[PDB]
């Protein structure tokens, strides 16, 4: 894979617009599923399906739960960074 991080700013609804998928105690590896239209993540053209996320605003997500990561991004405001891995 290729380690990469992009600084995407939050939208009006405090949602960069990006889906993920992961578990816990077996599948702690969180990854991206797809993107939504009219979203900063889509319009920007950086983070989307195929790219595995492994960081946010410098923090580490490789180990957290789906609900944990989701709330993490929703909590962050402004220039939100996402360390995705091109696969």
């Amino acid at each position: 894979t290729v380690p990469g991080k992009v600084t995407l700013q939050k939208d009006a609804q405090n949602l960069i617009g990006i889906s993920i998928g992961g578990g816990a105690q077996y599948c702690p590896c969180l990854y991206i599923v797809q993107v939504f239209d009219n979203t900063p993540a889509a319009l920007d053209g950086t983070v989307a399906a195929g790219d595995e996320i492994t960081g946010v605003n410098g923090r580490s997500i490789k180990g957290k739960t789906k609900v944990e990561v989701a709330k993490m991004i929703q909590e962050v405001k402004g220039e939100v960074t996402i360390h995705y891995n091109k696969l």
Partner: peptide, 5 residues
């Protein structure tokens, strides 16, 4: 299932 944020 896919949590969107």
């Amino acid at each position: 299932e896919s949590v969107k944020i």
